[PDB]
Scaffold this active site. Structure first.
Site, PDB file in Angstrom:
ATOM      1  N   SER A  20       2.875 -38.827 -14.726  1.00 26.51           N
ATOM      2  CA  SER A  20       1.724 -38.739 -14.202  1.00 26.51           C
ATOM      3  C   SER A  20       0.511 -38.892 -14.980  1.00 26.51           C
ATOM      4  CB  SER A  20       1.535 -36.852 -14.554  1.00 26.51           C
ATOM      5  OG  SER A  20       0.078 -36.573 -14.015  1.00 26.51           O
ATOM      6  N   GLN A  22      -3.730 -41.000 -14.429  1.00 29.48           N
ATOM      7  CA  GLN A  22      -4.489 -39.982 -14.486  1.00 29.48           C
ATOM      8  C   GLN A  22      -5.854 -40.601 -13.365  1.00 29.48           C
ATOM      9  OE1 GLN A  22     -10.175 -40.948 -16.763  1.00 29.48           O
ATOM     10  NE2 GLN A  22      -7.937 -42.446 -17.392  1.00 29.48           N
ATOM     11  N   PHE A  23      -4.491 -41.086 -12.609  1.00 32.90           N
ATOM     12  CA  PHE A  23      -4.885 -41.910 -11.009  1.00 32.90           C
ATOM     13  C   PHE A  23      -3.739 -42.138 -10.710  1.00 32.90           C
ATOM     14  CE2 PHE A  23      -8.870 -43.228 -12.996  1.00 32.90           C
ATOM     15  CZ  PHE A  23     -10.099 -42.256 -12.933  1.00 32.90           C
ATOM     16  N   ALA A  24      -2.475 -41.232 -11.145  1.00 28.49           N
ATOM     17  CA  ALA A  24      -1.061 -41.974 -10.519  1.00 28.49           C
ATOM     18  C   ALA A  24      -0.749 -41.355 -10.639  1.00 28.49           C
ATOM     19  CB  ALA A  24      -0.698 -43.506 -10.839  1.00 28.49           C
ATOM     20  N   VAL A  25       0.512 -40.412  -9.784  1.00 29.57           N
ATOM     21  CA  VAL A  25       2.066 -40.029 -10.366  1.00 29.57           C
ATOM     22  C   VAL A  25       2.793 -40.352  -9.695  1.00 29.57           C
ATOM     23  CG1 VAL A  25       1.375 -38.297  -7.840  1.00 29.57           C
ATOM     24  CG2 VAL A  25       2.739 -37.793 -10.054  1.00 29.57           C
ATOM     25  N   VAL A  26       3.970 -40.932 -10.322  1.00 27.02           N
ATOM     26  CA  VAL A  26       5.549 -41.138  -9.469  1.00 27.02           C
ATOM     27  C   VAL A  26       6.591 -40.264  -9.697  1.00 27.02           C
ATOM     28  CG1 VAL A  26       7.259 -43.194 -10.582  1.00 27.02           C
ATOM     29  CG2 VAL A  26       4.700 -42.979 -11.163  1.00 27.02           C
ATOM     30  N   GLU A  93      10.595 -50.166  -7.350  1.00 25.26           N
ATOM     31  CA  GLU A  93      12.446 -50.538  -7.928  1.00 25.26           C
ATOM     32  C   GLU A  93      12.436 -49.241  -8.713  1.00 25.26           C
ATOM     33  OE1 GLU A  93      12.826 -53.827 -10.073  1.00 25.26           O
ATOM     34  OE2 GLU A  93      15.205 -53.518 -10.045  1.00 25.26           O
ATOM     35  N   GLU A  99      11.200 -44.001 -20.484  1.00 23.09           N
ATOM     36  CA  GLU A  99      10.308 -45.299 -21.491  1.00 23.09           C
ATOM     37  C   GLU A  99      11.047 -45.444 -22.533  1.00 23.09           C
ATOM     38  OE1 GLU A  99       6.491 -43.688 -22.424  1.00 23.09           O
ATOM     39  OE2 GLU A  99       6.838 -42.394 -20.033  1.00 23.09           O
ATOM     40  N   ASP A 138      -1.660 -54.789 -20.600  1.00 23.91           N
ATOM     41  CA  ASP A 138      -1.343 -52.733 -20.848  1.00 23.91           C
ATOM     42  C   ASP A 138       0.183 -52.881 -21.623  1.00 23.91           C
ATOM     43  OD1 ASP A 138      -2.176 -50.766 -21.041  1.00 23.91           O
ATOM     44  OD2 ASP A 138      -1.324 -50.130 -19.313  1.00 23.91           O
ATOM     45  N   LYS A 140       2.711 -52.354 -23.536  1.00 24.97           N
ATOM     46  CA  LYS A 140       3.237 -51.496 -24.882  1.00 24.97           C
ATOM     47  C   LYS A 140       4.551 -50.468 -24.351  1.00 24.97           C
ATOM     48  CE  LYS A 140      -0.566 -48.394 -21.880  1.00 24.97           C
ATOM     49  NZ  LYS A 140      -0.856 -46.488 -21.883  1.00 24.97           N
ATOM     50  N   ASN A 143       5.044 -48.863 -21.076  1.00 27.66           N
ATOM     51  CA  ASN A 143       5.266 -49.678 -19.939  1.00 27.66           C
ATOM     52  C   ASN A 143       6.190 -50.650 -19.908  1.00 27.66           C
ATOM     53  OD1 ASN A 143       1.775 -50.074 -18.871  1.00 27.66           O
ATOM     54  ND2 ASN A 143       3.124 -48.232 -18.729  1.00 27.66           N
ATOM     55  N   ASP A 160       3.932 -50.936 -14.657  1.00 24.87           N
ATOM     56  CA  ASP A 160       2.385 -51.077 -14.114  1.00 24.87           C
ATOM     57  C   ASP A 160       1.986 -51.827 -14.641  1.00 24.87           C
ATOM     58  OD1 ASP A 160      -0.007 -49.883 -14.456  1.00 24.87           O
ATOM     59  OD2 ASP A 160       0.617 -48.492 -16.288  1.00 24.87           O
ATOM     60  N   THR A 179      -5.197 -50.022 -23.876  1.00 30.52           N
ATOM     61  CA  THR A 179      -5.022 -48.490 -24.854  1.00 30.52           C
ATOM     62  C   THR A 179      -5.409 -49.869 -25.981  1.00 30.52           C
ATOM     63  OG1 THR A 179      -3.488 -47.831 -23.450  1.00 30.52           O
ATOM     64  CG2 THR A 179      -3.358 -47.126 -25.870  1.00 30.52           C
TER      65      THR A 179
END
Length: 280
Positions: A20, A22-26, A93, A99, A138, A140, A143, A160, A179
């Protein structure tokens, strides 16, 4: 570009929520027609042009466009795109090994062999991206996803692409910012950005892989950013006393303030060690 507007629920069944933002949920999902599993990324749309909530159409379309171009084992693939009044849903996919961030949190630190095993895959994926003039912006541990974390040499995929951009004119100048702990000095200083920014991030990731510590992390975001801009980091003996000089050399050539003097992705693959938001 318009996307499929049929209800995604008529074609997919969802399950466990992977992450989850700030503007997306998987969420994990299964396609009804094939039984194949995917990851459904729900990106919240903006409800007004001057709204700070949600992601602009332009930004969503950029991510989708880039994902559609990419096809490589070390990069997440895009299957379909749906949309409704509130969200754009990317059917991606499924990578369920977790992570690299979580994997590292359990092992504390990796041996140079384990680190290079991961790095070689990350470098191969970034080589593919940079070859297509695509900057991720991005990179890190969060990701980087593992396919299976229960094998001695986990395979990975870069995910991401929310900040990813096509660099067709050598650089982008539009306040792109990731970040603090992983951004290059040019990002901190709001200067033109290019593929070089990703190489700096790779240096930060490598430092973390080998030590379990973050090179520029301060107690606040401003401190971290100030540290990054001044290239304020050191190979602490407590963490690096048994690390090879070549590994340090590799990191040192990536954590360079001048983007032009930083190792490129091609340089990194030939390096002897390898060669076989911002406001609090």
């Amino acid at each position: 570009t318009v996307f499929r507007q049929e209800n995604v629920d008529d074609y997919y069944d969802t399950g466990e929520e992977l992450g989850s933002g700030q503007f997306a949920v998987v969420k994990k999902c299964r396609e009804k027609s094939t039984g194949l599993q995917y990851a459904a990324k729900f990106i919240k749309k903006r409800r007004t042009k001057s709204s700070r909530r949600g992601v602009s159409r332009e930004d969503i379309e950029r991510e989708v466009s880039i994902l559609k171009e990419i096809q490589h084992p070390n990069v997440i693939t895009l299957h379909e795109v749906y949309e409704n009044k509130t969200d754009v849903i990317l059917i991606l996919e499924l990578v369920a090994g977790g992570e690299l961030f979580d994997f590292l949190a359990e092992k504390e630190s990796l041996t140079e062999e384990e680190a290079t095993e991961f790095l070689k895959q990350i470098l191969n994926g970034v080589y593919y991206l940079h070859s297509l003039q695509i900057a991720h912006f991005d990179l890190k541990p969060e990701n980087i996803m593992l396919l299976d974390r229960n094998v001695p040499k986990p395979r990975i995929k870069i995910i991401d692409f929310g900040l990813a951009h096509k660099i067709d004119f050598g650089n982008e100048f539009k306040n792109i910012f990731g970040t603090p702990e992983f951004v290059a000095p040019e990002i901190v200083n709001y200067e033109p950005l290019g593929l070089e920014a990703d190489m700096w991030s790779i240096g930060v990731i490598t430092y973390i892989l080998l030590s379990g510590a973050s090179p520029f992390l301060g107690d606040t975001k401003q401190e971290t950013l100030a540290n990054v801009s001044a290239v304020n980091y050191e190979f602490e003996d407590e963490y690096f006393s048994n690390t090879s000089a070549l590994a340090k050399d590799f990191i040192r050539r990536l954590l360079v303030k001048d983007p032009k003097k930083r190792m490129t992705i091609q340089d990194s693959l030939q390096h002897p060690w390898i060669k076989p938001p911002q406001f609090e």
